[PDB]
């Protein structure tokens, strides 16, 4: 039952007890620990100030307009040929493939893999992507 | 002893 | 109740028999419950009767008269109870009109050493029991450490000053028997710091709360952690407080560390993230160039070149996604950092001013125990707390001396007679004293019993002022050595005009240093005439005794000028400064429970001495040398009422031995 906010463990008491100036020793160790952590902070905040400078301007000179293209069911030769290349670059990342092609949903791409398996040697293309 | 305190009677440690 | 309140006012449990009662009434306490309640009622009623009119003797006959049935049934029981109460001083103590005048045939002879309150009280009782009593007193007056200053209309006490509550206090009875002008003391006590300015209310309350928390913690350290020995030496209250304060300082520092440590953990997370973002920004830069180049290839183009533009577009928006989700994470860690930067824990446990004000409360503790806190037993300093009386504390406006003077009425008191040697043997005692004004005039008093009420200070004196022959046994002298005998002093300042707040009885002055914390730390305005009274407590008390009155009065006036203004504070008409440690008949102010001692030492001080037999193989002698005084009473040490009570106890023990129970 210690008073609430006083702090008094057997352990901490023994540490200030067992020597004539363990009191003032404990308190200097911690004073130094505190001084050293404060200079650690100055190091790291000054390091981070310099990094936030090298990020000046964001990525806003390098950002690209949103192209909101109306999705389409008919496969052009152009679109088929974009796909076979997209499959060669990206894996089965059906999302990526679709984003490249510009007007095919993730399902349409998924279907494409089965519909043109034989004709676009898609098994050779994924074997080629892995090596 | 503590009982002698008239001004600002200490309470800490007394039941 | 009225019967139950009589028990309370006599420091007795109303519904239970005490140890002292068990001894005289073994048949009743080992007997059936119903008879105990009859006893208890008879006891409580007889006390009530005495307490309702303590100015006249209460006889067994008048007691029996006023009981109803079934309590007046047994008339030996009523006689046994009445006699017990009279013998132990619970009734017919103090100053009262005797009904049947005192029998002129005196049984037994007692010499009482000292005519302070313990001695006077014992003397009255012993006379009333029919003994022949003589008191030897070294001073030119009675009262001892009740010492009242008198000059003109100025009246101020240099020793005992305050009745510490009437609830349970035998001085209540004495106040109905003697005109003490008892006046309630109001609790309100503002502190003024060294500059002369009120401590502001919020700080005052915070330091006081911290003081009591610190004290509570020393108690916790003592009782729960058994922190009572350190370097093979008993722990003092002063040490314990130091340790507790150090651990609060430790925690303040541990808390800062922990806080700044989580600031670094968060800055290092941010560092890692900012590096990740700087690398990705340069990756985005290059990849934008690659898309720019690929799209500057004007159409018409083959499908690999169209793919190049499209694939780089996708890759560049995907990386712009990552960097957007990372600057989210950047923004939240920067908020967390501004929060911790603005919520630091405390810089210090206590400021300089805080520790000064804390020291005032420590000085107040040094006043109470009349000693530096480094001398107090940690475990036992407050061992008498449960017997605190209830009610307001009161000034004795007549001067407390009115009490001993009244108690001296009709007693054989020899003033200016300093006891030098006490001799006790199996056939009786002789006390050898001298005249304080010419030390060659020697006196020899022969008696059956000696009651020693010499102050603990005097008993401690080395080389001794009083020699015991044979020497006191080691059990007594060791107790005398272990007990503390403290010091405390008073500066009385008498003025032509009141320049202070007439409705405030008490005000503090906070010293600049720990060393001087006791120095003129508390002022009292208690009297009708314009008097202020300042205390010198703690380490200051001993040191201030070797400084002149003019200087001490100077430092008082300096303080008071600071508080009320230089033009408001005239030079006082009369001044007085007590020097209790230097007084050869006191050698200090009052006892305290020293480190290494306990309440049990007070009981050892109270035990009478029994001499060896004169001729060998003679039967065991009776006790010859008895002890009373403030230092002899475990439950009421260091007080006027403890002294009074200790006298009553010894008169009874002595009467039991020499007049028979
Ligand atoms: C500064 C101060 C303030 C106090 N304030 C209070 C207070 O506010 N309230 C309270 O209840 N109590 C207070 N007390 C305590 C109270 O004064 C004592 O506890 C009480 O008066 C002691 O009574 P006593 O009979 O035990 O000893 P004392 O009154 O000292 O009586 C002992 C007698 O022995 C005499 N004597 C000494 N040597 C010899 C010798 N060789 N031969 C013959 N006689 C000798 C002394 O002169 C003295 O008369 C205070 C004490 C002091 C010192």
Do you know the residue count of chain B? Answer: 15
- The structure's method of determination equals X-ray
> Contact at 8 Å (CB) between A8 and C217?
yes
Residues with Cβ within 8 Å of residue C328, at least 6 apart in sequence: none
Q: Is A110 helix (H, G, I), strand (E, B) or coil?
A: helix
Is the Cβ–Cβ distance between C48 and C2 less than 8 Å? yes
What three-state secondary structure class fits C289? helix
Give the pair of three-digit tokens for residue C456: 């603990």
What is d(CA C526, CA C486) in angstroms, rounded to the nearest whole number?
A: 24
Q: How far apart are CA C598 and CA C634, in angstroms?
A: 9
Instruction: Flag whether C258 is marked binding.
Output: no
Q: What is the dihedral of CA C556, C562, C567, C569, to 10 degrees?
A: -30
| C398 Cβ neighbours under 8 A, 6+ residues apart | C155, C179, C180, C181
| CA C287 and chain centroid, separation | 83
Long-range contacts of the stretch A78-83 (C-beta < 8 A, 24+): A78/C303, A78/C306, A79/A103, A79/A104, A80/A116, A80/A120, A81/C303, A81/C307, A82/C303, A82/C306, A82/C307, A82/C310, A83/A109, A83/A112, A83/A120
Least CB-CB distance to C212: which of B4, B12, B15?
Answer: B12
The CATH number given to A1-131 is 1.20.58.1880
At A99, give phi and psi (nearest 5°).
-60, -40
Place of tokens 């308190």: A27
Return phi, psi of residue C199, to 5°.
Answer: -60, 135
Reference A80, options A62, A100, A66, A64; nearest CA is A100
Using alpha carbons only, what angle is made at residue C396 by residues C393 and C398, rounded to the nearest 5 degrees?
A: 165
CB C376 within 8 A of CB C90: no
Long-range contacts of C159-162, Cβ-Cβ distance < 8 Å, separation of 24 or more: C159/C400, C159/C578, C159/C580, C159/C589, C160/C400, C160/C639, C160/C640, C161/C395, C161/C396, C161/C400, C161/C524, C161/C526, C161/C533, C162/B4, C162/B6, C162/C393, C162/C394, C162/C395, C162/C396
Greatest Cα pair distance, chain B, in angstroms, is 19
Cross-strand bridge partners of residue C509 = C192
Looking up tokens 């010198």, which residue turns up?
C536
Inter-chain contact B14–C639, Cβ cutoff 8 Å? Answer: no
Closest CA to C386 of A84, A5, A28, B14: B14
**Residue A73 · residue A109 · CB < 8 Å:** no
C585 Cα to the center of ligand 1, angstroms: 9
Scan for tokens 């230092």, then name that residue.
Answer: C631
- The H or E element containing residue C11 is none
**C230: CB partners within 8 A, 6+ apart:** A17, C239
- Residues in contact with ligand 1 (CB, 6 Å cut-off): C 113-119, 136-139, 144-146, 159-162, 164, 418-419, 453-455, 458, 465-466, 488, 490, 580, 585-586, 589-590, 629-630, 638-641, 643
**CA atoms of A102 and A81, how far apart (whole Å):** 13
Distance CA(C285)–CA(A60), nearest Å, equals 10
Provide the 8-state DSSP code for C424: E
How distant, in Å, are the alpha carbons of A63, A100, C119, C243, C336 from that of C287? Answer: 11, 16, 107, 66, 33
Task: Report the greatest alpha carbon distance in chain A.
Answer: 91
For ligand 1, the distance from its centroid to the CA atom of residue C422, given in whole angstroms, is 20
DSSP-derived secondary structure for A11-70: HHHHHHHSSTTHHHHHHHHHHHHHHHHHHHHHHHHHHHHHHHHHTTTTTTTS--------
Q: Report the SS3 class of residue C494.
A: strand
C434 Cβ contact list (under 8 Å, min separation 6):
C417, C418, C420, C440, C441, C442, C443
Question: φ and ψ at C547, to 5 degrees?
Answer: -135, 145
C489 exposure class (CB count in 10 Å sphere: 0-12, 13-18, 19+): buried
Which residues are registered as beta bridge partners of C148? C157
Within 10 Å of residue C555's Cβ, how many Cβ atoms? 17
Kindly list the distances between the CA atom of residue C423 and the CA atoms of C111, C468, C473, in Å, as whole numbers in the listed order: 12, 6, 14
**Beta partners for residue C491, in sequence order:** C534, C577
CB-CB contact of C189 with C195 (8 Å): no
Beta-bridge partner residues of C449: C110
How many of the other CB atoms lie within 10 Å of CB of C103?
A: 8
Q: In what order do the strands lie in the sheet with C109-113?
A: C412-414, C132-136, C109-113, C449-452, C625-627
Q: List the Cα angle C506/C508/C513 in 5-degree steps.
A: 160
Candidates C449, C447, C549, C565; CA nearest to C494 is C549
C592 strand-pairing partners? C484
Omega cis (within 30) before C300: yes
Rounded Cα distance between C240 and A17, Å, is 10
Distance CA C351, CA C207 (A): 11
Dump strand ranges (E) for C464-545.
Answer: 467-469, 484-485, 489-494, 506-509, 519-524, 531-536
CA distances from A52 to A26, C249, C275 (A): 39, 38, 9
Q: At what angle do helices A77-89 and A94-101 cross, to 10 degrees?
A: 140
Give, as one character, the DSSP assignment of residue C370: T
- Token readout for A35 is 């001084």
| CA atoms of C157 and C162, how far apart (whole Å) | 9
CB C116 within 8 A of CB C643: yes
Contact assessment for residue C183 and residue C657, using Cβ atoms and an 8 Å cutoff: no
Residue C565 near residue C344 (C-beta atoms within 8 A): no
Contact by Cβ (8 Å): C459, C480: yes
- Residue carrying structure tokens 């990094």: A51
Domain C235-350 belongs to what architecture?
A: Orthogonal Bundle (1.10)
Report residue C241 as tokens.
């407080």
DSSP codes joined into one string, C132-188? EEEEE-SSSSSBTT--EEEETTEEEESS--EE--SBT-HHHHHHHHS---EEEPP--
Residue with tokens 């002149």: C548
Tokens 């001085």 map to which residue? Answer: C171
Contact between C542 and C457 (Cβ < 8 Å) = no
Rounded to whole angstroms, the Cα distance separating C651 from C121 reads 8
CATH architecture of C1-108: Orthogonal Bundle (1.10)
- Cα–Cα distance, C548 to C553 (Å, whole number): 9
Strands laid side by side in the C162-163 sheet: C162-163, C394-396, C182-184
Distance CA A26, CA A21 (A): 9
Contact C142, C361 (CB under 8 A): no
Within 8 A by CB and 6+ apart from A9, the residues are none
Taking CA–CA distances from C309, the nearest residue in chain A reads A100
Substitution target from C189, C223, C365, C369 for chain B, most B beta carbons within 10 A: C365
Alpha carbons C569 and C558: distance in angstroms, whole number: 9
How far apart CA C204 and CA C153 sit, in angstroms, is 36
Classify residue C245 by its DSSP letter. H
**What is the per-residue DSSP string for C455-486?**
-HHHHH-SS-SSEEESPPPHHHHHHHHHSEE-
CA distance C486 to C490: 14
Is B7–C214 a contact, with Cβ atoms under 8 angstroms apart? no
In the numeric block, which tokens belong to residue C287? 């990849």
Phi, psi of C492 (to 5 degrees): -105, 125
Resolution of the deposited coordinates, in angstroms?
2.5
Closest to C645 in 3D by CA, of C636, C656, C655? C636
* CB proximity under 8 Å: C 272-301 to A: 274-275, 277-278, 281, 284-285, 288, 291
Asked if C628 and C119 count as a contact pair (C-beta separation under 8 A), the reply is: yes
Q: Residue C656: CA atoms inside 13 Å, Cβ hemisphere, count? A: 17
Pairing verdict, β C162-163 and C394-396: antiparallel
Strands C132-136 and C412-414, bridge-based pairing: parallel
Residue C235 and residue C324: Cα distance in Å, rounded?
A: 65
> What residues form DSSP beta bridges with C154?
C151
Question: What are the residue ranges of CATH 1.10.10.10 in chain C?
Answer: 1-108
Task: Give the tokens for residue C389.
Answer: 């009386």
What are the chain B neighbours of C639 within 8 Å (beta carbons)? 3-4
- Strand runs (DSSP E) across C257-296, as ranges? none
Q: How far is C369 from chain B (nearest CA, A)?
A: 4
Q: How far apart are CA C352 and CA C41, in angstroms?
A: 59
């Amino acid at each position: 039952k210690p008073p609430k906010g006083m702090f008094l463990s057997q352990e901490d008491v023994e540490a200030v007890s067992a020597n004539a100036t363990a009191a003032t020793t404990v308190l200097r160790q911690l004073d130094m620990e505190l001084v050293s952590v404060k200079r650690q902070i100055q190091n790291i905040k000054q390091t981070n100030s310099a990094l936030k400078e090298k990020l000046d301007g964001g990525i806003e000179p390098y950002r690209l307009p949103e192209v909101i293209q109306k999705c389409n069911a008919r496969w052009t030769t152009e679109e088929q040929l974009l796909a076979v290349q997209a499959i060669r670059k990206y894996g089965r990342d059906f999302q990526a493939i679709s984003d490249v092609i510009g007007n095919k949903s993730v399902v349409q791409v998924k279907n494409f893999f089965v519909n043109y398996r034989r004709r676009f040697n898609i098994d050779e293309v994924l074997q080629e992507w892995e090596a | 002893s503590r009982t002698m305190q008239t001004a600002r009677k200490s309470t800490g440690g007394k039941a | 109740s009225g019967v139950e309140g009589a028990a309370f006012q006599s420091r007795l449990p109303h519904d239970r028999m005490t140890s002292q009662e068990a001894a005289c009434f073994p048949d009743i306490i080992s007997g059936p419950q119903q008879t105990q309640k009859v006893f208890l009622f008879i006891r409580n009623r007889t006390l009530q009767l005495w307490l309702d009119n303590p100015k006249i003797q209460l006889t067994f006959e008048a007691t029996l008269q006023q009981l109803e049935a079934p309590y007046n049934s047994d008339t030996v029981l009523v006689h046994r109870v009445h006699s017990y109460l009279e013998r132990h001083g619970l009734i017919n103590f103090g100053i009262y009109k005797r009904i049947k005048p005192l029998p002129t045939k005196k049984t037994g002879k007692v010499i009482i050493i000292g005519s302070g309150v313990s001695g006077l009280a014992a003397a009255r009782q012993l006379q009333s029991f029919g003994m022949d009593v003589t008191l030897l007193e070294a001073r030119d007056r009675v009262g001892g450490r009740v010492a009242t200053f008198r000059k003109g209309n100025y009246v101020a006490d240099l020793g005992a000053m305050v009745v510490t509550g009437l609830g349970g206090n035998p001085m209540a009875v004495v106040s109905k028997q003697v005109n003490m002008e008892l006046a309630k003391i109001k609790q309100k006590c503002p502190l003024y710091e060294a500059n002369g300015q009120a401590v502001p209310k919020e700080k005052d309350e915070m330091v006081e709360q911290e003081f009591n928390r610190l004290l509570e913690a020393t108690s916790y350290l003592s009782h729960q952690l058994d922190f009572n020995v350190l370097n093979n030496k008993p722990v003092s209250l002063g040490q314990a407080l130091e340790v507790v304060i150090q651990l609060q300082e430790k925690h303040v520092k541990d808390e800062q560390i922990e806080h700044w440590k989580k600031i670094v953990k968060t800055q290092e997370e941010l560092k890692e993230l900012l590096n990740k973002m700087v690398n990705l920004k340069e990756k985005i830069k290059e990849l934008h160039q690659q898309y720019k180049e690929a799209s500057e290839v004007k159409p018409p183009r083959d499908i690999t070149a169209e793919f190049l533009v499209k694939s780089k577009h996708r890759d560049l928006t995907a990386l712009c996604k990552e960097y957007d989700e990372l600057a989210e994470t950047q923004g939240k860690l920067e908020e967390k950092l501004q929060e911790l930067e603005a919520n630091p824990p405390s810089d210090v446990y206590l400021s300089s001013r805080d520790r000064q004000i804390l020291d005032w409360h420590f000085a107040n503790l040094e006043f109470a125990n009349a000693t530096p806190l480094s001398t107090l037993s940690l475990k036992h300093w407050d061992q008498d707390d449960d017997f605190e009386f209830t009610g307001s504390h009161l000034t004795v406006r007549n001067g407390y001396s009115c009490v001993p003077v009244a108690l001296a009425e009709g007693l054989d008191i020899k003033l200016n007679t300093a006891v030098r040697q006490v001799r006790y043997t199996a056939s009786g005692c002789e006390v050898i004293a001298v005249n304080t004004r010419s030390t060659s005039q020697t006196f020899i008093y022969k008696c059956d019993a000696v009651l020693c009420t010499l102050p603990l200070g005097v008993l401690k004196q080395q080389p001794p002022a009083v020699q015991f022959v044979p020497p006191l046994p080691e059990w007594k002298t060791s107790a005398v050595q272990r007990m503390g005998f403290g010091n405390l002093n008073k500066v009385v300042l008498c003025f032509d005009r009141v320049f202070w707040d007439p409705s405030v009885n008490l005000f503090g002055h906070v010293g600049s240093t720990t060393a001087s914390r006791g120095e003129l730390f508390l002022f009292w305005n208690l009297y009708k005439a314009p008097i202020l009274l300042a205390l010198v407590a703690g380490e200051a008390a001993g040191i201030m005794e070797n400084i002149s009155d003019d200087v001490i009065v100077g430092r008082c006036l300096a303080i008071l000028k600071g508080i009320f203004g230089s033009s408001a504070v005239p030079q006082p008409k009369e001044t007085v400064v007590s020097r209790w440690r230097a007084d050869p008949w006191a050698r200090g102010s009052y006892s305290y429970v020293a480190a290494g001692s306990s309440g049990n030492d007070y009981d050892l001080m109270a035990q009478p001495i029994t001499p060896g037999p004169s001729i060998p193989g003679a039967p065991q002698p009776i006790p010859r040398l008895f002890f009373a005084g403030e230092h002899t009473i475990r439950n009421y040490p260091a007080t006027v009422h403890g002294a009074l009570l200790s006298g009553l106890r010894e008169a009874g023990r002595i009467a039991d031995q020499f007049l028979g129970a």
